[PDB]
């Protein structure tokens, strides 16, 4: 019983942990490279950045 009594992880308490994992993912994937701004205007590169995901 001490397994749960000592550490009573509530649904919302564990929920916050899961959101951080998802937030870490979205930040890792959506992170796009930061090169010369006013120079990377090619139709191909901008197309890739839009669909970076």
């Amino acid at each position: 019983q001490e397994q749960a009594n000592l550490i009573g992880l509530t649904a919302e308490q564990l929920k916050s942990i899961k959101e951080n994992d998802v937030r870490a993912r979205k930040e890792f994937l959506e992170s796009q490279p930061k090169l010369d701004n006013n120079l990377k205007n090619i139709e191909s590169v901008k197309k890739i950045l839009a669909t970076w995901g």
Binding site: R25, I42, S44, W52, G53
Partner: protein, 48 residues
């Protein structure tokens, strides 16, 4: 003789504009290759 815009066949290279321009239009295209791979590997399963 068909697909090069030049006013003469006496080609003289004095700048690397036409050369570097074709490289950035080529090496850049292969960007997102690794990030795209990360999508598949990371979208596979959720750590939690």
């Amino acid at each position: 003789e068909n697909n090069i815009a030049s006013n003469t066949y006496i080609l003289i290279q004095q700048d690397v504009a036409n050369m570097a321009k074709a490289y950035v239009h080529d090496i850049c295209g292969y960007i997102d290759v690794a990030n795209k791979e990360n999508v598949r590997i990371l979208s596979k399963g959720d750590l939690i």
